[PDB]
Amino acid sequence: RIPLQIVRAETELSAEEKAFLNAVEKGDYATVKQALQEAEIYYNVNINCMDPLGRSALLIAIENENLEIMELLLNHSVYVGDALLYAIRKEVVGAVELLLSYQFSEFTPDITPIMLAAHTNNYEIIKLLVQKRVTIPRPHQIRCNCVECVSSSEVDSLRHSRSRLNIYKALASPSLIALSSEDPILTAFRLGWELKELSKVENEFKAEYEELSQQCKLFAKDLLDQARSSRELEIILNHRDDLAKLKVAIKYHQKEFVAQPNCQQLLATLWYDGFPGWRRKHWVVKLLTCMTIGFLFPMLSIAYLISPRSNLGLFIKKPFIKFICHTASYLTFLFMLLLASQDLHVQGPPPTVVEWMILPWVLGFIWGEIKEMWDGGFTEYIHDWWNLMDFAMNSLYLATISLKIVAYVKYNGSRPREEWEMWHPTLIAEALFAISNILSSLRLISLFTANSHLGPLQISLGRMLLDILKFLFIYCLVLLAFANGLNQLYFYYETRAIDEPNNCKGIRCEKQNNAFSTLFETLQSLFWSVFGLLNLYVTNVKARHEFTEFVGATMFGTYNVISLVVLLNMLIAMMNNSYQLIADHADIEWKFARTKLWMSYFDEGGTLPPPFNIISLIQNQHYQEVIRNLVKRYVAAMIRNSKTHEGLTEENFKELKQDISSFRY
Amino acid sequence: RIPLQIVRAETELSAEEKAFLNAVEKGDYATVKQALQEAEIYYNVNINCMDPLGRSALLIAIENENLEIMELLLNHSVYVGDALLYAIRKEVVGAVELLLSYQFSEFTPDITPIMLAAHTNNYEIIKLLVQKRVTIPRPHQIRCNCVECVSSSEVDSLRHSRSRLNIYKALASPSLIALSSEDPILTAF
Amino acid sequence: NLVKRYVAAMIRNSKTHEGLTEENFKELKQDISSFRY
Numbered sequence: 001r002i003p004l005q006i007v008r009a010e011t012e013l014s015a016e017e018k019a020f021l022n023a024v025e026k027g028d029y030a031t032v033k034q035a036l037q038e039a040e041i042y043y044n045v046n047i048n049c050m051d052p053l054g055r056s057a058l059l060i061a062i063e064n065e066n067l068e069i070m071e072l073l074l075n076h077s078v079y080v081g082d083a084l085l086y087a088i089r090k091e092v093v094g095a096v097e098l099l100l101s102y103q104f105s106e107f108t109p110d111i112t113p114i115m116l117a118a119h120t121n122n123y124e125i126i127k128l129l130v131q132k133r134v135t136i137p138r139p140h141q142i143r144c145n146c147v148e149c150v151s152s153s154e155v156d157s158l159r160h161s162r163s164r165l166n167i168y169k170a171l172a173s174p175s176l177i178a179l180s181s182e183d184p185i186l187t188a189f190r191l192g193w194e195l196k197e198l199s200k201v202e203n204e205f206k207a208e209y210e211e212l213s214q215q216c217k218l219f220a221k222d223l224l225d226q227a228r229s230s231r232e233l234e235i236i237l238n239h240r241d242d243l244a245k246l247k248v249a250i251k252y253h254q255k256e257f258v259a260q261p262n263c264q265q266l267l268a269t270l271w272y273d274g275f276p277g278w279r280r281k282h283w284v285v286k287l288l289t290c291m292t293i294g295f296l297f298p299m300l301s302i303a304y305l306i307s308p309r310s311n312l313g314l315f316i317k318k319p320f321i322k323f324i325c326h327t328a329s330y331l332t333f334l335f336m337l338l339l340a341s342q343d344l345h346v347q348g349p350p351p352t353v354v355e356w357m358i359l360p361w362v363l364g365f366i367w368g369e370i371k372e373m374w375d376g377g378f379t380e381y382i383h384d385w386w387n388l389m390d391f392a393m394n395s396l397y398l399a400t401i402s403l404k405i406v407a408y409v410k411y412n413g414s415r416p417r418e419e420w421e422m423w424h425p426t427l428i429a430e431a432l433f434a435i436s437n438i439l440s441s442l443r444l445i446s447l448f449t450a451n452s453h454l455g456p457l458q459i460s461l462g463r464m465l466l467d468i469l470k471f472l473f474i475y476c477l478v479l480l481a482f483a484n485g486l487n488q489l490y491f492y493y494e495t496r497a498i499d500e501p502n503n504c505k506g507i508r509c510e511k512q513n514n515a516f517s518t519l520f521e522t523l524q525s526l527f528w529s530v531f532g533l534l535n536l537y538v539t540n541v542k543a544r545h546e547f548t549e550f551v552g553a554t555m556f557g558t559y560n561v562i563s564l565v566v567l568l569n570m571l572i573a574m575m576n577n578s579y580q581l582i583a584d585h586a587d588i589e590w591k592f593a594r595t596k597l598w599m600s601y602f603d604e605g606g607t608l609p610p611p612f613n614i615i616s617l618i619q620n621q622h623y624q625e626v627i628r629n630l631v632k633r634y635v636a637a638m639i640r641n642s643k644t645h646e647g648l649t650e651e652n653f654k655e656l657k658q659d660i661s662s663f664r665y
Numbered sequence: 666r667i668p669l670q671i672v673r674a675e676t677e678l679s680a681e682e683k684a685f686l687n688a689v690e691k692g693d694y695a696t697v698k699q700a701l702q703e704a705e706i707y708y709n710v711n712i713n714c715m716d717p718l719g720r721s722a723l724l725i726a727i728e729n730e731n732l733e734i735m736e737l738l739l740n741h742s743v744y745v746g747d748a749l750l751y752a753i754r755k756e757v758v759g760a761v762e763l764l765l766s767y768q769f770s771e772f773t774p775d776i777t778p779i780m781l782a783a784h785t786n787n788y789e790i791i792k793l794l795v796q797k798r799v800t801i802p803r804p805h806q807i808r809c810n811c812v813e814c815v816s817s818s819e820v821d822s823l824r825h826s827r828s829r830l831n832i833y834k835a836l837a838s839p840s841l842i843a844l845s846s847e848d849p850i851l852t853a854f
Numbered sequence: 855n856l857v858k859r860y861v862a863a864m865i866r867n868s869k870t871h872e873g874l875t876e877e878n879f880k881e882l883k884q885d886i887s888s889f890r891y
């Protein structure tokens with residue numbers, strides 16, 4: 001039999017001090033007033049009593065929303081501590097104003113009235129509080145090591161983290177940004193960037209910072225949405241302190257802001273400068289004009305080089321024409337590379353005509369690469385992740401040219417490749433040239449972002465590469481373990497290449513042998529076993545060691561099972577789970593990428609294609625006026641969205657009943 | 666210490682012109698009438714004042730849905746601009762009829778009362794508006810290259826696109842197809 | 855202390871819903887009717 005009792009006992013009640021609490025709970029004004037005045041005359045009661053549910057007279061008045069009992073209690077000199085915070089958090093303007101005009105608490109001691117107003121995001125009460133000179137502390141830099149920060153973290157770290165989070169949550173309020181801010185858009189950009197940076201540093205508190213950054217981005221997008229004229233749109237997008245604001249938004253990774261329909265329409269208008277009917281055109285005529293502009297790229301380049309100011313001179317300044325010319329030049333370079341492969345008995349031959357034509361394009365590519373790193377900088381150069389492939393290709397081409405010139409200078413004989421050594425400079429140069437051709441042909445993937453059908457697909461594939469890289473580590477660990485074991489088992493029976501039928505050793509021969517004799521060969525065999533290109537008799541020895549053969553076969557079968565049946569199927573499940581979430585924002589990511597690609601062609605520098613490449617207060621006032629108009633529209637819209645819900649409004653009957661009762665009285 | 670202040674400051678208030686706004690907000694008919702007549706006799710108040718939340722006397726009457734204060738304010742010769750649109754968009758038939766019988770705006774300048782009625786898709790108010798001879802502009806063919814279309818797109822393209830979208834959204838209303846159409850099925854197709 | 859805070863928070867979460875509270879008009883109507891009587 002479980003003796004149910006009270007373990008933590010509170011104080012007793014049911015005196016006159018509880019009588020007048022329950023009178024206030026009833027709320028009848030006359031009875032409350034008479035009981036309170038009688039108790040005050042008697043001078044034997046207090047006002048510190050607490051109900052079992054955790055509410056007092058003032059808290060119950062807060063919950064019931066009765067201004068008459070509110071003013072009566074406040075004029076009766078009841079306790080006032082935290083009552084302003086409770087009223088602000090209850091979100092009633094009349095009692096907030098009344099309390100402003102004049103133990104156990106569910107409020108953190110660091111909470112300020114302005115902080116709570118910012119947390120609750122109420123425009124009216126926020127303005128009412130901010131009309132007085134109220135301020136907010138500064139949280140220190142992200143990696144501050146100053147004595148004040150180290151000391152405060154040492155005395156109490158949980159309170160410090162909570163205070164920082166509360167300060168940032170109050171600062172990231174859309175209303176508190178609408179007021180007391182000269183540039184709300186820039187403020188939102190910087191705040192979102194700072195919160196995104198803070199999320200990584202504060203590992204335990206990540207979701208809160210991420211949601212604050214998302215809220216800032218959404219506020220910026222909603223503020224942009226209210227523009228209702230092309231003049232206002234261009235003023236906003238061109239304000240600086242062209243398209244400086246758009247460049248800043250691209251830098252700060254504001255994909256929702258960038259992918260706005262109005263901004264995209266303006267960008268398309270700027271992009272299709274030469275053609276004004278490109279929107280209303282047939283696919284056949286678009287294709288025909290595409291070839292007819294791409295075919296005359298050398299003529300256009302020569303015309304611009306000769307006469308920069310002419311009818312044909314300025315025809316290449318348009319971004320679309322420049323993009324078409326660059327694409328045609330790259331396609332011509334790739335065609336030359338393909339034609340190159342279509343006497344081989346000389347040692348270090350002079351370059352042929354195809355290589356002579358290929359060299360100016362390669363030199364131009366390198367020149368264009370260095371200028372962009374000099375103009376952009378190291379961080380911008382490495383952020384693209386395509387410049388890595390560009391640098392690798394250019395370095396490989398430079399090494400190929402150097403090796404070819406070295407071979408030409410050194411060797412001058414005529415000997416067969418069957419007698420040439422394995423480390424010949426000519427052979428090294430051909431291998432590097434083949435790798436360079438592979439990389440250059442693979443470089444064409446970056447042009448898929450300009451298309452409507454392939455951009456999101458390419459963006460989705462790029463996102464999944466990360467999961468591929470993550471699984472590669474586990475696969476490599478398993479492969480290393482099994483290769484170590486197999487080599488340790490099989491390294492005893494190594495045989496020389498002379499004893500083999502065709503003087504061939506390894507797995508790249510018809511007589512596959514010595515598959516696990518060395519660690520490198522074991523790694524190669526275990527890699528090739530995934531695709532089923534390794535035979536089954538490689539796990540055999542010339543001697544009759546049936547136990548050893550069976551153990552090796554068991555190891556091989558276990559590795560095959562683990563690699564193919566379990567790990568490969570698990571990768572597939574991860575790809576599906578990742579792509580399900582990836583497919584949601586494909587449009588936004590593709591539009592951001594296409595905007596970056598489009599703006600990459602707006603600059604005046606580098607107009608020519610690679611082969612020929614080698615050879616101020618009025619604006620502030622206008623922006624302020626437009627920002628004021630947008631803020632007013634946004635405030636109205638968000639007030640309405642707050643009014644969209646709770647459609648079953650009340651107290652209209654109470655107000656009318658009070659009025660008619662007074663008239664009857 | 667972050668100095669919180671006001672960056673964009675509006676006009677001041679709390680005069681008799683704000684007194685009678687908050688009287689209208691209270692909505693007591695006798696008090697509103699006596700205050701309004703006293704202010705009219707004094708001849709020192711206006712009716713153009715705006716609350717901090719973006720509402721006026723007529724807008725608050727729209728939101729509160731009080732026909733008596735509505736007719737009192739309208740017979741007191743308050744400003745009437747856009748009030749018909751606000752009433753139609755609030756979707757109250759009594760005040761829509763009363764307003765039909767007789768700055769900062771959250772409505773696009775191209776919005777027409779019939780267009781807003783079609784957007785909101787209210788059969789009764791749509792019929793009440795369409796009983797009068799009201800019409801709708803034609804958007805041009807899909808690939809129109811005519812001078813009027815090219816010129817209007819050149820002066821302002823965002824407004825042109827918005828106007829086209831609003832016209833088509835008004836035209837694609839199921840109620841506006843049920844009325845004023847001989848073959849609703851073919852029209853919908 | 856933790857129990858008190860948790861009880862307050864869960865009472866509030868119970869009060870978070872049913873925001874369209876009633877019987878306030880009934881109590882006021884009963885009071886004014888008695889005063890009129």
Ligand SMILES: CC(C)CCC[C@@H](C)[C@H]1CC[C@H]2[C@@H]3CC=C4C[C@@H](OC(=O)CCC(=O)O)CC[C@]4(C)[C@H]3CC[C@]12C
Pocket residue numbers: 473474476477480
């Ligand atoms: C996977 C292939 C290439 C074989 C490599 C074998 C070892 C060199 C690897 C396999 C697992 C690795 C470990 C995996 C994870 C960790 C935890 C890691 O912990 C942290 O990074 C702690 C700090 C933090 O992340 O907050 C430190 C390295 C260590 C021990 C790694 C050390 C290197 C190990 C032993």
Ligand SMILES: [Ca+2]
Pocket residue numbers: 386387390
């Ligand atoms: Ca590049």
Ligand SMILES: [Zn+2]
Pocket residue numbers: 140141144145146147148149
């Ligand atoms: Zn510090």
Ligand SMILES: [Zn+2]
Pocket residue numbers: 805806809810811812813814
């Ligand atoms: Zn036209």
